[PDB]
Amino acid sequence: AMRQCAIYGKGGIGKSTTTQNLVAALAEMGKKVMIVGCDPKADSTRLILHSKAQNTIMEMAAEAGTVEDLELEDVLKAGYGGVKCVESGGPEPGVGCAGRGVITAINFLEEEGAYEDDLDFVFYDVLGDVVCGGFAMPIRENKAQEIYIVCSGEMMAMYAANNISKGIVKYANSGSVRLGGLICNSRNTDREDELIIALANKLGTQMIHFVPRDNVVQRAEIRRMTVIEYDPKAKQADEYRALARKVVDNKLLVIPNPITMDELEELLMEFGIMEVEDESIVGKTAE
Amino acid sequence: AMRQCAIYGKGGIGKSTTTQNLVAALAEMGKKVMIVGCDPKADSTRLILHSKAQNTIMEMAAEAGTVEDLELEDVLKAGYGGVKCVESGGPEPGVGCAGRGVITAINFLEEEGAYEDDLDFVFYDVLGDVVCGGFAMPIRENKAQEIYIVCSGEMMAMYAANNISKGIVKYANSGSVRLGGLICNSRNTDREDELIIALANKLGTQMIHFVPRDNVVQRAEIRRMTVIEYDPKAKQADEYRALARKVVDNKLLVIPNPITMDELEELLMEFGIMEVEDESIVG
Ligand SMILES: Nc1ncnc2c1ncn2[C@@H]1O[C@H](COP(=O)(O)OP(=O)(O)O)[C@@H](O)[C@H]1O
Ligand code: SF4
Ligand SMILES: [Mg+2]
Numbered sequence: 001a002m003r004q005c006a007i008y009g010k011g012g013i014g015k016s017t018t019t020q021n022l023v024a025a026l027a028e029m030g031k032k033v034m035i036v037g038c039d040p041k042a043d044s045t046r047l048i049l050h051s052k053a054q055n056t057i058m059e060m061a062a063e064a065g066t067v068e069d070l071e072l073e074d075v076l077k078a079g080y081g082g083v084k085c086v087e088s089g090g091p092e093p094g095v096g097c098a099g100r101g102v103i104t105a106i107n108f109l110e111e112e113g114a115y116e117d118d119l120d121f122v123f124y125d126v127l128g129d130v131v132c133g134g135f136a137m138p139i140r141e142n143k144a145q146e147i148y149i150v151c152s153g154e155m156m157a158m159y160a161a162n163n164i165s166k167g168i169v170k171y172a173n174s175g176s177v178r179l180g181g182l183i184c185n186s187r188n189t190d191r192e193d194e195l196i197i198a199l200a201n202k203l204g205t206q207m208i209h210f211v212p213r214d215n216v217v218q219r220a221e222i223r224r225m226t227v228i229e230y231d232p233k234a235k236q237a238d239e240y241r242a243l244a245r246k247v248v249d250n251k252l253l254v255i256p257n258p259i260t261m262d263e264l265e266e267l268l269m270e271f272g273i274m275e276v277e278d279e280s281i282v283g284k285t286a287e
Numbered sequence: 288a289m290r291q292c293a294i295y296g297k298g299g300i301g302k303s304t305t306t307q308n309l310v311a312a313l314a315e316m317g318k319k320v321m322i323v324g325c326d327p328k329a330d331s332t333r334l335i336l337h338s339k340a341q342n343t344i345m346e347m348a349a350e351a352g353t354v355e356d357l358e359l360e361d362v363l364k365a366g367y368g369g370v371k372c373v374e375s376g377g378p379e380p381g382v383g384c385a386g387r388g389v390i391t392a393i394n395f396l397e398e399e400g401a402y403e404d405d406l407d408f409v410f411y412d413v414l415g416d417v418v419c420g421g422f423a424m425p426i427r428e429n430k431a432q433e434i435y436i437v438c439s440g441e442m443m444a445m446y447a448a449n450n451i452s453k454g455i456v457k458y459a460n461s462g463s464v465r466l467g468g469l470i471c472n473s474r475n476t477d478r479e480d481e482l483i484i485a486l487a488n489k490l491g492t493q494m495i496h497f498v499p500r501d502n503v504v505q506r507a508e509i510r511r512m513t514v515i516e517y518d519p520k521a522k523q524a525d526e527y528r529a530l531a532r533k534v535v536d537n538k539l540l541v542i543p544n545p546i547t548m549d550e551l552e553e554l555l556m557e558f559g560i561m562e563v564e565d566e567s568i569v570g
């Protein structure tokens with residue numbers, strides 16, 4: 001029972017933060033994890049291990065020349081709750097695919113054999129920013145089965161999810177890639193709550209959890225580490241833990257179901273967030 | 288002497304918009320422009336067309352099964368000012384790639400003689416949200432000369448510019464790719480004005496202009512139209528008009544010179560934004 005989980009989600013939402021704390025519980029619980037920070041953007045492995053920025057496979061492969069010279073012991077960095085930390089690393093810019101990058105990390109890791117051990121989980125942290133080859137990798141490759149879309153009360157977030165869905169679709173008909181559900185993060189939005197719900201439903205999944213916005217977090221980060229770690233007794237902690245059980249316990253893995261644009265348009269409209277439109281279109285006060 | 292520029296940057300700043308107001312000025316300004324939407328995220332073409340969404344090639348292609356089919360018309364939509372509007376087409380979700388996607392467009396445009404008809408400008412609607420192999424193409428495949436990053440006083444918007452810069456480099460040595468300036472799209476940040484400048488310098492370029500946040504913007508948007516088209520007699524309308532001015536000229540085409548993280552951090556330190564960092568790490 002070693003579960004191979006990956007998150008997606010656009011960025012700027014909180015994607016990373018969550019997945020970490022979210023692990024932190026998963027640890028407090030009594031399981032074993034290893035985050036595979038596939039985010040160029042975010043610091044998939046930061047709160048845990050406490051250093052602002054870890055070394056990346058690339059950057060290492062970099063300075064040594066090839067995965068060869070990459071001795072595990074350096075890439076792999078022991079964290080909180082014996083938590084697993086390896087940063088895949090972002091493509092040299094202007095030049096390179098993000099697929100190959102990550103892939104590498106995997107063929108590395110499988111090869112330097114990390115997946116072995118005892119571990120309970122494999123958390124691929126990922127960019128839902130744009131669903132392209134590079135990203136579907138762990139998908140396509142089939143290296144991640146259980147996928148959770150970090151969602152939110154936001155039109156992009158919305159949008160991502162959907163692509164990250166067709167994402168899945170293209171392949172589920174192939175292997176075992178499946179979607180646990182979304183995870184509305186709090187964005188103070190009026191009716192987020194329902195909104196995310198509308199999706200999942202529309203889609204074919206649930207909304208595993210919903211994350212309130214509590215200063216504590218912020219306060220947690222600013223400190224460079226988990227919220228768990230900050231004040232396990234803090235409310236939000238139980239906030240997270242929940243989701244942590246929640247996931248363990250998921251038995252709702254599904255072959256998503258992409259929606260139209262249109263449809264997406266309505267919901268936004270309906271729950272009121274993408275304001276109604278008229279056949280105005282002109283003149284500018286000249287009418 | 289048709290120029291091949293292209294705008295880049297992070298999604299969610301208005302790029303597509305500011306990009307689009309610009310393109311209009313050029314028009315009010317006599318210039319013959321064409322614009323190639325190569326962003327999956329945004330409204331690249333639109334506001335020239337008053338269309339809910341243009342039909343992308345790669346999207347058009349699919350229908351026939353081939354592009355060899357795809358009829359120019361079907362693909363080149365003529366918007367206000369006579370702005371040749373074309374939209375690349377997304378990276379087919381989960382399976383496929385952007386570069387692969389942009390390309391297709393370009394060949395096809397040349398191949399149908401898009402690039403003739405006496406042109407004054409061509410804008411590439413790019414997305415540096417993550418500049419990888421394939422958001423570089425139009426670079427690497429030297430079809431975009433005149434680069435301008437779109438920035439704004441914020442953490443990843445900047446982060447990216449740098450990166451997006453690093454792109455230009457690589458193709459330094461490759462030659463023919465130079466970064467015009469930046470354009471700060473104000474986010475009401477209290478030292479923005481200042482900040483972006485700071486980058487620019489540390490970077491080694493000029494922040495050509497600083498797009499303000501005049502609600503007269505949206506009011507157009509919401510009408511699927513350019514500020515100009517809208518109220519042309521508008522504080523904003525000039526502001527865009529001032530940008531095309533500075534742009535049909537701007538002769539300082541730098542080779543960038545990228546900064547380090549802390550350098551970066553720092554700036555954000557400097558303005559308070561990413562103010563002081565605590566040394567302690569406990570609870
Ligand atoms: N095409 C997309 N695919 C997946 N996620 C998307 C997409 N568009 C938006 N989302 C998310 O929204 C953000 C980018 O959109 P945004 O910042 O609004 O765009 P723009 O500059 O065109 O207005 C990213 O975090 C991205 O992941
Ligand atoms: S596969 Fe995707 S991320 Fe990689 S280079 Fe192509 S478009 Fe960019
Ligand atoms: Mg984040």
Ligand SMILES: [Mg+2]
Pocket residue numbers: 298299300301302303304329330
């Ligand atoms: Mg925009």
